[PDB]
Design a protein around this nucleic acid. Structure first.
Lengths: 70, 108, 90, 106
RNA sequence: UCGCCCAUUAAAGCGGUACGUGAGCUGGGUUCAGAACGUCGUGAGACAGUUCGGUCCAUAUCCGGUGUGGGCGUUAGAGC
RNA sequence: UCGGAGAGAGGCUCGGUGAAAUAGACAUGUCUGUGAAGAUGCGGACUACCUGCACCUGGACAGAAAGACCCUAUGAAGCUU
RNA sequence: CGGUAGGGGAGCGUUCCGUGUUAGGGAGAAACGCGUGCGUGAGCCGCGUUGGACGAAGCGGAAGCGAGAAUGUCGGCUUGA
RNA sequence: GGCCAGUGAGACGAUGGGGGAUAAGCUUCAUCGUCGAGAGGGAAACAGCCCGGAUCACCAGCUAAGGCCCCUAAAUGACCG
RNA sequence: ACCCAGAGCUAGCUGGUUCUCCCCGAAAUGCGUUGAGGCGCAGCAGUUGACUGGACAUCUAGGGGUAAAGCACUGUUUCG
RNA sequence: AGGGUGAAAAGAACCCCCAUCGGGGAGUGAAAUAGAACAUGAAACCGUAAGCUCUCAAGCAGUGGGAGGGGGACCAGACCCUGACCGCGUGCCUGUUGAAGAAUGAGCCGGCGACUCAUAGGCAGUGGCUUGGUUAAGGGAACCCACCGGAGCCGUAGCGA
């Protein structure tokens, strides 16, 4: 019956105003002392999910309002 | 007849790190484009050209790359912008892209 | 009205005898497929990425207040002495 | 006729490829007569004798009996059956116009 | 199997044929369950280590074979 | 050794009754060659009238039981610490 | 314009429903078996015999809708004889 | 870039090598051919070699690879070894 | 033990999956995987939109340390 | 597991074979090429009759060529049945790098016998509205159905935990 949302995944993929899926980067929870100032700044920020993995993410949670660019 | 096979003590490596010349001699570059990932200074830094923490050699300005001769048995890399770059509609490329465009427009 | 694919009724109709599923294996068999998002035992994306700051224990997402209109959007719905442009009239 | 030779004698009919442009009852002359024969027969040096032109009449342009073309390959579920009726034409030969050239026969 | 030995003998050849032949035979050996010895195993159990005990089917369609008929053929038909 | 003779019950023939497992289709030779590397069916040769009945089992990788060995399945079940 | 997996386009039939208590039909329907018609094909179309009452098109609709393989399954009948 | 597949056992040959015994119709990589999924002709038969890419009809013609004593298409052709 | 029920248990495994014509047409690789005869993503099909120009051919410019060659370096080696 | 003579039992008086069974005439009936094993009566399988044709052959049984013979109460260089002898031609399926395979499956013939339905999500095609669109339950001389029901949903503002 009416699709349950994959609320394990949902909590890692937000969608932006224009409609792109966005995630947080992996790496910077602990063992921070040994990494640079530089790379922690790139690991702070959000970027798109790669076009490859859209299929799995959209497929998991089907109430997103997500526009693959068309 | 069925004897035991002796194990090796080998079988380790690292997957090739992908060093070498990314932007070749007499070729386009950018402000910030990595020209060479070299492990030591095989090539040396010339004019218009940064040299990084890893002896990575990158261009500061536009222009084409140049691999000069350093003096006693070494190599340099400098970058030079180019003055005027002419295009003639006479040529084959120009003829054919306009022909193609005109076909595209003609059809639709 | 398209007329669909009654599937597996001769090799001329096309999608016949195995019915466009190739040759054995997990996706061929009857029944449910897999988990969706499953990466094959490799760690799935949806479980190897951290989870979006606020949504990670409490903090209700910023659900919008106020029902925003704009001055640009009002002008199209014209009235001279616009008698109280409010929740009623709009 | 249709890149295809025929011995042809008068008061007698032949089957050929469907002649494109030809009517049902409509007489025609065939100008590719590579040989003629009688008591004293007459070969040809070049092609066509010279001014010899055979005189005939079209009868009908019905199709041939069905030939069944059948593509088949072993074990690949590749049975493909397809008929083909080649269109032909029936023509009736009225007379040979005389040769008046190169008399052979010894 | 191979091998050694006794008595011989012209001589006691060596191989292929699914190490010929189990819808031809045998079942002593080796691949089931029982039981024991040595050993390995904390234990259940284990060991081309050893020992005793342990159900071997079949009416021949075809080819193929050994026999044996019948038909027909051999130019008119027969017996020698 | 090293077989031989004979008696019964079959086998064989006649009359009566009358099954079976098996079976893609079977107009179903030998040799050597070939090929999924071991062919009545493919190539070259050779041999061979058509068809019963009695006997014999070398082949049809003959029949019988989706190998019980071996290994696989993130199979099952017993038993041990 | 070769084509396995495989994708896309265009069709044929099957029973039932709307049109339709249509015409066609005990001067012979459904069926069943034969055709020196047709189509690229699935199939179509006319025939007079057997048959003894149902029921075409066309335009549309819906599915228990197409079989040679499942050591499938039910029934019939062989082979061995 | 959207929608929606199969594949993820490969095989042989040429070359460059490794492993092996510079044994294997062995194995593993790199570059290319064919098979796989490709009929036809040459190779007696002969996936993988050579030629050549099958829309369909013709009782027409020219040729590739390869051949011209007979089985079996074409010279029991030529001149020099 | 059997019988009935949960129960059409599940089976990344094997078998099977039915009418016709036309168009295009693969892969048997890399990466990860309690994974290796499974699956994911890439690679290679179809289909449908958008962006432009390439493709095959010839000719220049670039950095290469391989076949070759060599003994100045690193080893190895025979004779004086 | 095992339904269907006929409208009506009118279910066969009598005669013949004859101990029975059953059969042939008769009689009934529209029909008994409806006789109780009875209505339509396919295939496998079993025969009987006619046309051609095999006993020096070798063959996945066809196919191209076709000798000789036979036709159909309808005058054809047309058509059909047989087929002397020649050339070609490694059953189908599954499934494989590769199967004529001596790998798997089927004795044969007929039936039954497999991507469906409900609800949601994405996408495409088509249509309606675009004063934005749409109603859910629920109400309807029931069910469909005019006609109501605007409760909700989707679109109209993002950014940030």
């Amino acid at each position: 019956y009416k699709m349950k949302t994959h609320k394990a995944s949902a909590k890692r993929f937000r969608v932006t105003g224009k409609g792109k899926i966005v995630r947080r980067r992996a790496g910077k929870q602990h063992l921070l002392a040994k990494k640079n100032t530089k790379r922690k700044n790139r690991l702070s920020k959000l970027i798109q999910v790669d076009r490859s993995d859209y299929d799995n993410v959209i497929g998991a949670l089907p109430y997103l309002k997500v526009n693959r660019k068309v | 007849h069925k004897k035991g096979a002796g194990s090796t003590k080998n079988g380790r490596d690292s997957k090739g790190q992908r060093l070498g010349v990314k932007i070749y001699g007499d070729q386009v570059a950018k402000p910030g484009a990595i020209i060479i990932r070299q492990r030591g200074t095989k090539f040396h830094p010339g004019k218009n050209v940064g040299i990084g923490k890893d002896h990575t050699i990158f261009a500061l300005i536009d222009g084409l790359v140049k691999f000069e001769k350093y003096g006693p048995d070494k190599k340099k890399v400098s970058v030079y912008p180019r003055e005027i770059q002419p295009e003639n509609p006479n040529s084959y490329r120009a003829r054919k892209r306009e022909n193609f465009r005109l076909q595209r427009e003609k059809k639709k | 009205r398209k007329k669909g694919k009654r599937k597996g009724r001769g090799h001329a109709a096309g999608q016949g005898g195995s019915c466009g599923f190739g040759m054995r294996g997990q996706k061929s068999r009857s029944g449910p497929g897999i988990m969706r998002g499953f990466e094959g035992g490799q760690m799935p994306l949806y479980r190897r990425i951290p989870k979006l700051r606020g949504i990670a224990g409490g903090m209700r997402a910023g659900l919008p207040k106020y029902v925003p209109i704009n001055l640009r959007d009002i002008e199209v719905a014209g009235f001279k002495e616009g008698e109280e442009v409010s929740l009623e009239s709009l | 006729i249709g890149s295809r030779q025929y011995i042809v004698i008068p008061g007698r009919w032949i089957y050929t490829q469907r002649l494109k442009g030809a009517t049902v009852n409509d007489k025609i002359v065939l100008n590719k007569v590579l040989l003629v024969g009688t008591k004293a027969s007459t070969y040809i040096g070049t092609p066509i004798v010279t001014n010899a032109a055979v005189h005939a009449v079209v009868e009908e342009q019905l199709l041939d009996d069905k030939v069944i073309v059948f593509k088949y390959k072993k074990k690949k579920n590749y049975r493909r059956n397809i008929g083909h009726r080649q269109p032909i034409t029936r023509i009736k030969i009225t007379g040979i116009t005389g040769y008046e050239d190169y008399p052979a026969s010894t």
